[PDB]
Design a protein around this ligand. Structure first.
Ligand SMILES: C=CC1=C(C)/C(=C/c2[nH]c(/C=C3N=C(/C=C4\NC(=O)C(C)=C4C=C)C(C)=C\3CCC(=O)O)c(CCC(=O)O)c2C)NC1=O
Ligand SMILES: C=CC1=C(C)/C(=C/c2[nH]c(/C=C3N=C(/C=C4\NC(=O)C(C)=C4C=C)C(C)=C\3CCC(=O)O)c(CCC(=O)O)c2C)NC1=O
Ligand SMILES: C=CC1=C(C)/C(=C/c2[nH]c(/C=C3N=C(/C=C4\NC(=O)C(C)=C4C=C)C(C)=C\3CCC(=O)O)c(CCC(=O)O)c2C)NC1=O
Ligand SMILES: C=CC1=C(C)/C(=C/c2[nH]c(/C=C3N=C(/C=C4\NC(=O)C(C)=C4C=C)C(C)=C\3CCC(=O)O)c(CCC(=O)O)c2C)NC1=O
Lengths: 169, 169, 169, 169
């Protein structure tokens, strides 16, 4: 995660967030540097749960070409704030997952922040329904991140090159 | 939930709890009074989840013969404490669910407590793999409940009459 | 605490809340029924703390003329939300304390809610800098309470009779 | 804080922890590397609170000779676990503080852990009533830390040199 001074901000989340339209495959496009990051080509696949919330299956391509995957469950602990989710990954403690912005069909902006006293740890990701996203959409989502203090200059562009990422197919 | 003096106790939970063996159908036998309890003939069905934890489907027979059902998800937030679950029901805030004692094939004793300052609210339930449970097992589980301050003569016996409950089939 | 259907509401809190001006003595005027309420003539005294937040000293007149007192600490866990405090009483688990409305020199409306699955438990109190408060102010604060579902005809009027309460002096 | 893979461990805390005997001045002797650490010569001063818990005043000597200090409040949220404290520092989010071991008159071992998904952030400190502690006591407290996975090889010895730390007097 990205660690820096200050307490977690509380940005606005997506209004009338509809988890049913958020299901399916998302590609990782851009994100904060992540000390724990294993790989490239990252996707998140969200699916139906017979309980509440939805199920999570994330996949990434390690430098050696091995695919690393993790399974999880996503639940909105407050049903009146359906965009403020808790993610329960196998063998992980619970972490927050906030959908700050999505149009369901093209893009989403996700934020996770955990307080560490007078510092905090964050994930922040731009994702896409495709392995790329238009520069115009990226710049708008970067504008949203700068409005709660994310340094857009620090964001890393994920490797989604078709040949490099072919091991994912 | 039943409101009583004192902060939540912390009873011992089932050693080496195995959620796989805990899945399937449980019948409500006896429980604490519950002001918003709907119905009798109550069952809990626990099933596989494609993410973490397991999925919850509870059913009860309302007075006019309708079956009320609720969907939920159960997750052990700490995998080293697998008998201390959080239940996430549609339309409810998270509640704890502690498996105090089970032999998986006959009985379980479950407890849930939320602190209210110097007072608390609790659920406590004896459940069975059949619509009845032997008196000797009920008595042993009442003894466990009395060891952390549950009053035995508050417990209600659930109506599990085969004719009254036949709408459940 | 008073148990009712529904999950906790989230009423608006006092803008620009200034704990320094909120210190000193407050008299209980009206509150929700409270099964473990001890006494009448209730006052809350808030004082400086050498750490963060402020210190709490609550007093009430028991039926046999003894004064019951409790010590606590109040901390706003998020300094950007200074009217959303946590109160830590001797012998109690943490409880929320939200200053919904105050003019610092006459009245305050305080609210505390804890979720119990699909139901909740709450405290709600109208307090005054004097042992009485004008009817017009009581009526306005009842209107605020009714806007998030408090039933006005549940509220109890605290005994603040100068002769009955004289043991408090 | 020190960040590494895995979830927070839950080590045993000091039995019958008595906050009254823990009050006064403690010197920082040894601790985990701390990405947020400002200075050397660190002391913690714990004092009476008119509310619950105790008040905190920490001081350290920066490389330029300026003294940095912070104020805080310490509260045990569960009165039955008085060694498991929450520390509320001015402008910080709440952080845990566990007294793992103390004899009140010579030494204490303190641990703080916050989960970051499949990693965690920790503080771990050996403190003393004096600017030094016997090697025998340090080695015993290091044994306690190794028993829940702390790498004693990573611990840093705090500069408590009388001449360097004279700016603290
Ligand atoms: C932004 C919020 C965000 C959260 C809450 C998050 C948490 C998170 N992601 C994980 C894995 C993972 N997370 C991803 C990918 C994603 N995960 C996503 O939330 C998204 C949007 C993607 C990208 C498409 C992958 C591929 C893994 C497994 C490999 C790895 O650990 O890097 C893990 C578990 C690590 C483990 O088991 O070792 C956590 C706790 N990651 C995030 O980026
Ligand atoms: C002891 C722990 C215990 C917990 C944590 C618990 C929680 C719990 N049970 C619920 C419903 C329900 N719970 C049950 C039944 C059960 N529920 C069970 O956990 C068990 C063991 C049974 C019985 C076999 C049923 C039938 C419903 C739906 C009907 C109703 O609302 O009463 C709800 C939601 C109510 C709503 O949406 O209005 C909560 C929060 N109930 C408990 O009894
Ligand atoms: C509305 C929020 C509200 C909160 C958070 C609250 C909590 C609260 N009040 C308590 C006691 C008490 N609380 C009060 C009085 C007050 N307490 C107040 O917060 C206010 C505004 C007054 C009144 C002026 C008194 C007199 C006691 C001690 C007597 C008693 O236990 O009833 C206790 C501890 C009980 C014990 O140790 O047994 C709690 C948890 N009370 C509330 O009314
Ligand atoms: C081991 C638990 C432990 C906790 C919970 C802890 C938390 C903690 N210590 C802080 C400051 C501080 N903490 C210390 C010192 C100490 N603090 C102590 O808990 C102890 C035992 C000492 C040492 C004697 C000092 C001197 C500061 C202020 C200067 C600095 O930020 O380094 C801050 C606030 C930083 C700020 O306002 O910028 C936090 C959150 N530090 C810890 O070491």
């Amino acid at each position: 995660m990205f660690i820096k001074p200050g307490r977690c901000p509380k940005p606005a989340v997506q209004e009338d967030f509809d988890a049913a339209r958020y299901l399916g495959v998302w590609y990782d496009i851009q994100r904060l540097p992540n000390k724990f990051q294993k790989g490239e080509c990252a996707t998140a696949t969200y699916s139906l749960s017979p309980g509440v919330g939805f199920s999570v299956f994330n996949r990434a391509r390690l430098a050696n070409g091995t695919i690393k995957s993790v399974i999880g469950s996503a639940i909105a602990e407050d049903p009146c704030e359906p965009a403020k989710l808790q993610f329960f990954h196998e063998n992980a403690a619970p972490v927050p997952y906030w959908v700050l912005s999505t149009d369901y069909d093209n893009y989403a902006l996700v934020y996770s922040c955990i307080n560490l006293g007078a510092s905090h740890a964050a994930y922040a990701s731009i994702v896409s329904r495709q392995p790329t996203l238009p520069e115009e959409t990226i710049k708008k989502l970067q504008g949203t991140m700068s409005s709660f203090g994310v340094g857009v200059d620090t964001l890393l562009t994920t490797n989604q090159d078709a040949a490099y990422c072919s091991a994912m197919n």
